[PDB]
């Protein structure tokens, strides 16, 4: 719970990345000319009024001043997309002067800033894009274990997302063996565009190949999780640190937004949209209403601001 | 580099020193007087102010300074020692220091090398072409190298004197006959200022080769 | 001796800091990270030459 600032740079010399400071005195670890490379910068509320004040004196760049009492990453966001008027944000910068420990944030992805050179554009999309993420174990699936489509009509809803741009995201917890047999048994990859397995599980981190099967060019599904939080509980929550790593594979470097659609509400940490998978042992075809939301969701910004 | 603001911060200290040389009755460039005999005790006051600062940012704690000595200047390599081209002396009370022009304007004669050697940041638009659309002052990398090269002979002397003040005549001879004490030593009390010192910056060795 | 700091009376000093940092902006290229050598290279030489 706190008051926050930010910087905006005046030249967007490079747009779109903001960055996150521990101290007012961190341009001095920045040094000259590399603050031209985040268009803005949150700091949280100076206690010394003095400092706001020599803040409110620079006319280097522009600024704004707000309260967050929300301590949440999509909050925050939303928050800073209502004040600059922008629909979309780049990634967070961080440096070995390890950044303040706003770590209810940390589940994320984090930008050692050297990387800023390394930030290619992509062909992927000529819009903005929207992502959607999926499962399969049981998301959307017929509860038999020989899944039917619910729909033909989402079997072509799937090419048809690609009118506007949704990328299509499905993260298996299951093995990657069902899904083996899936993709023959139906070409949904053929409408879909990015798969993953083995997401079930988290592993006890601590600082102490499938391509045979028909040739195929698909992921290592690599031990990439970490114990991230080592607390008390069972929760595998769909990782936004995995999925923007494999996005920016992709060389997706920037998006609208994402929702997540999966039967495991847990998993969702303040995802921009979740959708609950009404678990079904028939095709139910009720794809008409989840589009409708979905649509709706997308629509929530021609306003100009979700709400 | 997470050392790089700090190598500024070098730079910084370098042109703290350099400015103040550089205003107060700087008269012109260093080589045109040095080139010279004219005003040998302009000379030996601007060594004099030079031993000041650094008597300043290495003893910072306290300003105060005996700047009551007596000063020599001499163009005769018979007076000549090799290594130390600067000396101090006492003579019956009669502090003094000592040095020969020519030496050092000999060795301050060489700076003409170029960086032209090695890797940089990559040639990018960022690096121009970004530049290239959208968004009395005369100073050479050149003449830096100098000054900062002579701050760097001084230091020895600093040292130097201030081991034989705190230990009288035969220690300084003793550190004369060998500079071992200078030899890898940063621990110091927090009055030295250790770490202001310039030989924490930059290290050498020859190869004996065949 | 033909000149006595006695004579000097002074603890020299400046502190025009956003002039000597807009002096250091134009320097701030400069690689010394790579030019400091030349002085140690000059420095040991003319002392091998005065041994010599």
Not at chain 1, 255 to 277: G, Q
Not at chain 2, 7 to 36: D, G, V
Not at chain 2, 74 to 84: A, F, H, V
Not at chain 2, 171 to 179: A, G, I, P, R
């Given at each position: 719970?706190?008051?926050?600032?930010?910087?905006?740079?005046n030249?967007?010399?490079?747009?779109?990345?903001?960055?996150?400071?521990?101290?007012?005195?961190?341009?001095?670890?920045?040094?000259?000319?590399?603050?031209?490379?985040?268009?803005?910068?949150?700091?949280?509320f100076?206690?010394?009024?003095?400092?706001?004040?020599?803040?409110?004196?620079?006319?280097?760049?522009?600024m704004?001043?707000?309260?967050?009492?929300?301590?949440?990453?999509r909050?925050?966001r939303?928050?800073?997309?209502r004040?600059?008027?922008?629909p979309?944000?780049?990634?967070?910068?961080?440096?070995?002067?390890?950044?303040?420990?706003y770590?209810?944030?940390?589940?994320?992805?984090?930008?050692?800033?050297?990387?800023?050179?390394?930030?290619?554009?992509?062909?992927?999309?000529?819009?903005?894009?929207?992502?959607?993420?999926?499962?399969?174990?049981?998301?959307?699936?017929?509860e038999?274990?020989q899944?039917?489509?619910?729909?033909?009509?989402?079997?072509?809803?799937?090419?048809?997302?690609?009118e506007?741009?949704?990328?299509?995201?499905?993260?298996?917890?299951?093995?990657?063996?069902?899904?083996?047999?899936?993709?023959?048994?139906?070409?949904?990859?053929?409408?879909?565009?990015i798969?993953?397995?083995?997401?079930?599980?988290?592993?006890?981190?601590?600082?102490?190949?499938?391509?045979?099967?028909?040739?195929?060019?698909?992921?290592?599904?690599?031990?990439?999780?970490?114990?991230?939080?080592?607390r008390s509980?069972?929760?595998?929550?769909?990782?936004?640190?995995?999925?923007?790593?494999?996005?920016?594979?992709?060389?997706?470097?920037?998006?609208?937004?994402?929702?997540?659609?999966?039967?495991?509400?847990?998993?969702?940490?303040?995802?921009d949209?979740?959708?609950?998978?009404?678990?079904?042992?028939?095709?139910?075809?009720?794809?008409?209403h989840?589009?409708?939301?979905?649509?709706?969701?997308?629509?929530?910004?021609?306003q100009?601001?979700?709400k | 580099?997470?050392?790089?603001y700090?190598?500024?911060?070098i730079?910084?200290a370098?042109?703290?020193?350099?400015?103040?040389?550089?205003?107060?009755?700087?008269?012109?460039?260093?080589?045109?007087?040095?080139?010279?005999?004219?005003?040998?005790?302009?000379?030996?006051?601007?060594?004099?102010?030079?031993?000041?600062?650094?008597?300043?940012?290495?003893?910072?704690?306290?300003?105060?300074?005996?700047?009551?000595?007596?000063?020599?200047?001499?163009?005769t390599?018979?007076?000549?020692?090799?290594?130390?081209?600067?000396?101090f002396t006492?003579?019956e009370?009669?502090?003094?220091?000592?040095?020969?022009?020519?030496?050092?304007?000999?060795?301050?004669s060489?700076?003409?090398?170029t960086?032209?050697?090695?890797?940089?940041?990559?040639?990018?638009?960022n690096?121009?072409?970004?530049?290239?659309?959208?968004?009395?002052?005369?100073?050479?990398?050149?003449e830096?190298?100098?000054?900062?090269?002579?701050?760097?002979?001084?230091?020895?002397?600093?040292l130097?004197?201030?081991?034989?003040?705190?230990?009288?005549?035969?220690?300084?001879?003793?550190?004369?006959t060998?500079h071992?004490?200078?030899?890898?030593?940063?621990?110091?009390?927090?009055?030295?200022?250790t770490?202001?010192?310039?030989?924490?910056?930059?290290?050498?060795?020859?190869?004996?080769?065949? | 001796?033909?000149?006595?700091?006695?004579?000097?009376?002074?603890?020299?000093?400046?502190?025009?800091?956003?002039?000597?940092?807009?002096?250091?902006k134009?320097?701030?290229?400069?690689?010394?990270?790579?030019?400091?050598?030349?002085?140690?290279?000059?420095?040991?030489?003319?002392?091998?030459?005065?041994?010599?």
């Amino acid at each position: 719970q706190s008051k926050w600032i930010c910087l905006r740079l005046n030249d967007a010399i490079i747009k779109r990345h903001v960055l996150v400071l521990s101290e007012y005195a961190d341009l001095k670890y920045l040094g000259f000319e590399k603050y031209k490379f985040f268009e803005y910068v949150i700091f949280q509320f100076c206690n010394d009024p003095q400092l706001c004040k020599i803040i409110e004196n620079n006319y280097n760049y522009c600024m704004q001043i707000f309260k967050a009492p929300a301590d949440d990453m999509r909050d925050i966001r939303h928050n800073i997309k209502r004040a600059f008027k922008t629909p979309v944000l780049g990634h967070m910068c961080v440096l070995s002067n390890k950044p303040p420990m706003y770590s209810f944030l940390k589940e994320w992805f984090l930008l050692p800033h050297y990387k800023v050179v390394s930030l290619k554009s992509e062909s992927l999309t000529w819009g903005f894009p929207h992502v959607v993420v999926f499962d399969l174990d049981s998301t959307l699936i017929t509860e038999e274990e020989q899944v039917e489509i619910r729909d033909p009509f989402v079997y072509d809803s799937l090419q048809e997302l690609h009118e506007m741009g949704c990328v299509l995201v499905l993260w298996s917890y299951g093995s990657r063996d069902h899904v083996a047999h899936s993709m023959r048994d139906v070409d949904l990859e053929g409408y879909f565009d990015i798969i993953i397995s083995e997401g079930s599980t988290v592993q006890e981190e601590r600082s102490d190949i499938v391509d045979y099967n028909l040739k195929k060019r698909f992921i290592e599904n690599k031990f990439v999780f970490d114990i991230h939080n080592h607390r008390s509980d069972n929760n595998i929550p769909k990782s936004p640190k995995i999925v923007i790593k494999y996005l920016s594979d992709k060389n997706v470097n920037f998006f609208k937004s994402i929702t997540l659609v999966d039967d495991l509400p847990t998993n969702n940490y303040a995802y921009d949209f979740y959708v609950k998978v009404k678990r079904c042992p028939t095709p139910v075809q009720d794809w008409e209403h989840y589009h409708n939301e979905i649509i709706q969701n997308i629509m929530d910004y021609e306003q100009y601001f979700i709400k | 580099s997470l050392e790089s603001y700090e190598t500024l911060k070098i730079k910084l200290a370098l042109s703290k020193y350099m400015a103040m040389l550089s205003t107060l009755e700087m008269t012109q460039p260093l080589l045109e007087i040095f080139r010279n005999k004219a005003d040998t005790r302009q000379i030996a006051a601007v060594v004099f102010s030079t031993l000041a600062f650094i008597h300043n940012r290495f003893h910072p704690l306290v300003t105060n300074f005996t700047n009551k000595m007596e000063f020599v200047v001499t163009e005769t390599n018979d007076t000549s020692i090799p290594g130390e081209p600067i000396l101090f002396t006492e003579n019956e009370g009669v502090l003094l220091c000592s040095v020969d022009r020519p030496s050092i304007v000999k060795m301050l004669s060489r700076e003409f090398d170029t960086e032209a050697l090695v890797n940089f940041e990559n040639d990018n638009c960022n690096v121009r072409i970004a530049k290239t659309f959208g968004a009395d002052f005369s100073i050479t990398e050149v003449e830096a190298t100098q000054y900062l090269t002579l701050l760097l002979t001084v230091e020895h002397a600093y040292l130097h004197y201030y081991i034989f003040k705190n230990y009288g005549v035969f220690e300084y001879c003793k550190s004369l006959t060998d500079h071992s004490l200078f030899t890898n030593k940063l621990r110091s009390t927090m009055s030295t200022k250790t770490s202001n010192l310039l030989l924490s910056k930059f290290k050498f060795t020859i190869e004996d080769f065949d | 001796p033909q000149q006595y700091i006695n004579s000097g009376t002074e603890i020299p000093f400046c502190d025009d800091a956003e002039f000597l940092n807009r002096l250091l902006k134009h320097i701030d290229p400069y690689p010394l990270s790579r030019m400091y050598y030349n002085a140690a290279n000059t420095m040991f030489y003319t002392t091998m030459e005065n041994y010599a």
